Design a protein around this ligand. Sequence first.
Ligand SMILES: [Mg+2]
Ligand SMILES: [Mg+2]
Ligand SMILES: [Mg+2]
Ligand SMILES: [Mg+2]
Ligand SMILES: [Mg+2]
Ligand SMILES: [Mg+2]
Ligand SMILES: [Mg+2]
Ligand SMILES: [Mg+2]
Ligand SMILES: [Mg+2]
Ligand SMILES: [Mg+2]
Ligand SMILES: [Mg+2]
Ligand SMILES: [Mg+2]
Ligand SMILES: [Mg+2]
Ligand SMILES: [Mg+2]
Ligand SMILES: [Mg+2]
Ligand SMILES: [Mg+2]
Ligand SMILES: [Mg+2]
Ligand SMILES: [Mg+2]
Ligand SMILES: [Mg+2]
Ligand SMILES: [Mg+2]
Ligand SMILES: [Mg+2]
Ligand SMILES: [Mg+2]
Ligand SMILES: [Mg+2]
Ligand SMILES: [Mg+2]
Ligand SMILES: [Mg+2]
Ligand SMILES: [Mg+2]
Ligand SMILES: [Mg+2]
Ligand SMILES: [Mg+2]
Ligand SMILES: [Mg+2]
Ligand SMILES: [Mg+2]
Ligand SMILES: [Mg+2]
Ligand SMILES: [Mg+2]
Ligand SMILES: [Mg+2]
Ligand SMILES: [Mg+2]
Ligand SMILES: [Mg+2]
Ligand SMILES: [Mg+2]
Ligand SMILES: [Mg+2]
Ligand SMILES: [Mg+2]
Ligand SMILES: [Mg+2]
Ligand SMILES: [Mg+2]
Ligand SMILES: [Mg+2]
Lengths: 60, 185, 144, 67
Amino acid sequence: AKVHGSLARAGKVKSQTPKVEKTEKPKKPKGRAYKRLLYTRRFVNVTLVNGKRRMNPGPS
Amino acid sequence: PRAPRTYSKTYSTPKRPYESSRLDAELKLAGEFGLKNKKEIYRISFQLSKIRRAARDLLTRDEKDPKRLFEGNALIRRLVRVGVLSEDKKKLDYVLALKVEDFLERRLQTQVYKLGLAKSVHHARVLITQRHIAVGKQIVNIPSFMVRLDSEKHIDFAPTSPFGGARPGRVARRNAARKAEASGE
Amino acid sequence: GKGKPRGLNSARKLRVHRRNNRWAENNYKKRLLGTAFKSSPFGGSSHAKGIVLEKLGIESKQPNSAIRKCVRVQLIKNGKKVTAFVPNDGCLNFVDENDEVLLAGFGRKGKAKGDIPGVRFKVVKVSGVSLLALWKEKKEKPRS
Amino acid sequence: SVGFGLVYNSVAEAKKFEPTYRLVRYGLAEKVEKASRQQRKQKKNRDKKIFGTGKRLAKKVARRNAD
RNA sequence: GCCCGUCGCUAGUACCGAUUGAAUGGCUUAGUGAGGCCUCAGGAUCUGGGA
RNA sequence: GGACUUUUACUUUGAAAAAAUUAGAGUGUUCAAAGCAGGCGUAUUGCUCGAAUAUAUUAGCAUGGAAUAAUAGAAUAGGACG
RNA sequence: GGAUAGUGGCCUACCAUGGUUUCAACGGGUAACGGGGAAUAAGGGUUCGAUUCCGGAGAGGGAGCCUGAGAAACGGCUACCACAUCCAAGGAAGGCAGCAGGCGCGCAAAUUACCCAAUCCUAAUUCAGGGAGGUAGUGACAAUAAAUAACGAUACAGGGCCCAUUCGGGUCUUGUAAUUGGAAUGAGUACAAUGUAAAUACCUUAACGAGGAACAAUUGGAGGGCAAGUCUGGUGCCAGCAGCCGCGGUAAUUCCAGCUCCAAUAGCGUAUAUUAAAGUUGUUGCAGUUAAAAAGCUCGUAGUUGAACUUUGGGCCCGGUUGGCCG
Ligand SMILES: [Mg+2]
Ligand SMILES: [Mg+2]
Ligand SMILES: [Mg+2]
Ligand SMILES: [Mg+2]
Ligand SMILES: [Mg+2]
Ligand SMILES: [Mg+2]
Ligand SMILES: [Mg+2]
Ligand SMILES: [Mg+2]
Ligand SMILES: [Mg+2]
Ligand SMILES: [Mg+2]
Ligand SMILES: [Mg+2]
Ligand SMILES: [Mg+2]
Ligand SMILES: [Mg+2]
Ligand SMILES: [Mg+2]
Ligand SMILES: [Mg+2]
Ligand SMILES: [Mg+2]
Ligand SMILES: [Mg+2]
Ligand SMILES: [Mg+2]
Ligand SMILES: [Mg+2]
Ligand SMILES: [Mg+2]
Ligand SMILES: [Mg+2]
Ligand SMILES: [Mg+2]
Ligand SMILES: [Mg+2]
Ligand SMILES: [Mg+2]
Ligand SMILES: [Mg+2]
Ligand SMILES: [Mg+2]
Ligand SMILES: [Mg+2]
Ligand SMILES: [Mg+2]
Ligand SMILES: [Mg+2]
Ligand SMILES: [Mg+2]
Ligand SMILES: [Mg+2]
Ligand SMILES: [Mg+2]
Ligand SMILES: [Mg+2]
Ligand SMILES: [Mg+2]
Ligand SMILES: [Mg+2]
Ligand SMILES: [Mg+2]
Ligand SMILES: [Mg+2]
Ligand SMILES: [Mg+2]
Ligand SMILES: [Mg+2]
Ligand SMILES: [Mg+2]
Ligand SMILES: [Mg+2]
């Protein structure tokens, strides 16, 4: 159908979302130590069991 | 015009990419044996798979068939050699059984921990890859060395590094140089 | 027994017969006609590089409403003229007419993507650099 | 460290049966050095264009400088 | 509710088609025919019938 | 050595058989991908195990089989044995 | 008969009318060198092989030939065609699908380096020559091993556990911690010796070389398929996303971001092709009343297919290889 529609707005929403700079955080261990940190997180000490289990909850 | 340098890969990847259960399963293993990769688990189950294959293909040949007896014995005597296969189950319907942790339970990584000497599967790694501990006088820095049973009695720190005498080495020797240089003259 | 001759010498019938019906397979026919090499904008090859003629504003298909921002490209090895998609927010700002671009497929075995009608390709690079990097900021567009 | 060793019955038998780079390593042979292997190639090839001695071609060219 | 076709707009693909249209490649009629090879001659010269 | 022999298919074992690749034995390249090494003493005058096996089909060759499936035979007897 | 090294329509005379074909001749196509083989893993298959070994063909295209034991040779010659270089304009010269290197072409591919030390080749030959070949450089083609951290103490918090009339912490550690603590090691840097033809790296190893400002892991994804949020801010059928289904028109679980989270991790996305899934090519193994599909009907050649029946039954001997009960 129509092919010469406007082009004015190309790059609109990216160029109007307010920047927020990344936040500086602890550096995560690479390799083994990470698989390690997961194991203890995922299994060893556990966290919750609300109903079952959740992995990225926020306000609950 | 030269002979091909031959090679092969040593690992294989899960058909299903995201099986929640196999994933939990895998991560635990890593956590138990101080692995860094899911590949290090892939590698082994791949070794296991082919072993199981040859074990299958053999056990369909007649009992007391030449190849079956030759290659079958050979297979078992290799497995027992490293301490994966139990002396009791020495007849390859339990090679056909077998399973991964039996293989895992035999890496240098593990043995260096299992009998004291490290008190952490991770410390176990770190130590090995840092030129401590050896098999003979021969130092080994590869965590997946796989301890050949009759080399288990000879695992100990190397005659070099600390932990086996012969120096503290630069990071401690730095502090000792800081004691007779500040306090004294 | 239905159809297929079960006989012990009927091999020749059995092969020929197959030969014939392979032609009802879309990939086998495509391969042997060489539709790849004959028709089809790209040479048979995986990507191809052309020059930008006009910046277009393709309106999407239903039930979507959008203007989809594409480029008419003239394939270098070919002269063949083709319309290609310029992905991610902006990027139509990266191109400009007469610029070189590296086109690639859309992952649909020929066949248009979603609400973009007619378009069977997508842009991957301009002036030798990559829309992607440009989009981020890891790299910059060349002099002229 | 594992290496390989030899020990000749005499030093005239070593000097003759040894690699000529080995007698060099040690100190019992001079490294008579030469032009780049490619320079020498280009030596040959220039000589290839000359039939006979050469110095005869000098004099015929000494005449050239007159004409 | 669903729904068919002409008709009208935009874009795309292929078809037919004056141009006895165009291009590349492989074989090839007829005509012309290089060059080496074989052969009939030849004889600058150079010796004992040959070179 | 002479004199003659209905043709086939199938299947068995076997010969002839490149290496590298593939399967695979032996060997602790520090592990491994590899490699085809290496291992023992008198480590001052040498001892020694290796460098396997298997697959290699269709065709051709060689041999065992005689089921399954073809073929030819004796009826104008121009038959078979002597 | 001639020709050839020699058989042969190889060629020539004479003579004849033959040779191939639905069991597919002949013709066309091939983005065709053939094999050893490669990729995919229930099996049966399907796809691929320009390319390390063997065979073949070629040297810009054709033809011709000299030498020679061997070439219809091209880093040999002659000619034509097509390119194309030098000139004093008279002429002369060239053949990278050798090694590098340049243009072009394109999605697509590295040094105008060293050496004959090895491997082997050739010559008159132990010696010379060898861009064969080896060496280094370029090199995330593939493939292997696997660093980015390890251990105590302390500050509460716990979960334990004995007791609980009730403070609770104290022992055995589960670990979340915004002060701590000394330990360890090669990434690198570098005496040295080793390496090597000479070097470079590797293996060795003196002196150096880790605390968050590193020596600081990535690549995609977080609605479903599909493992991980209904956080916060933005936009308002726009911008964009979405292999497919679908999201976006003002509280977006899909966009643009921040935070947090998942998967694989020195590697991860993407495009194209192919394979498995696919019993959606079906010999194994498909489907055809109504979903795609039985020719209106019968005859019929090729083709595939095609009932039963002929030495069976019984008796005797010989010598093996496993297995038992004893040894
Ligand atoms: Mg059809
Ligand atoms: Mg839809
Ligand atoms: Mg247009
Ligand atoms: Mg072209
Ligand atoms: Mg030279
Ligand atoms: Mg000379
Ligand atoms: Mg005309
Ligand atoms: Mg056989
Ligand atoms: Mg062998
Ligand atoms: Mg004749
Ligand atoms: Mg005729
Ligand atoms: Mg046919
Ligand atoms: Mg071709
Ligand atoms: Mg080939
Ligand atoms: Mg092929
Ligand atoms: Mg080609
Ligand atoms: Mg040739
Ligand atoms: Mg060329
Ligand atoms: Mg011709
Ligand atoms: Mg030639
Ligand atoms: Mg050349
Ligand atoms: Mg040549
Ligand atoms: Mg002149
Ligand atoms: Mg070249
Ligand atoms: Mg490349
Ligand atoms: Mg030489
Ligand atoms: Mg001499
Ligand atoms: Mg070279
Ligand atoms: Mg790092
Ligand atoms: Mg640090
Ligand atoms: Mg990220
Ligand atoms: Mg989920
Ligand atoms: Mg919102
Ligand atoms: Mg939101
Ligand atoms: Mg988000
Ligand atoms: Mg992957
Ligand atoms: Mg079958
Ligand atoms: Mg079906
Ligand atoms: Mg129907
Ligand atoms: Mg009918
Ligand atoms: Mg019958």
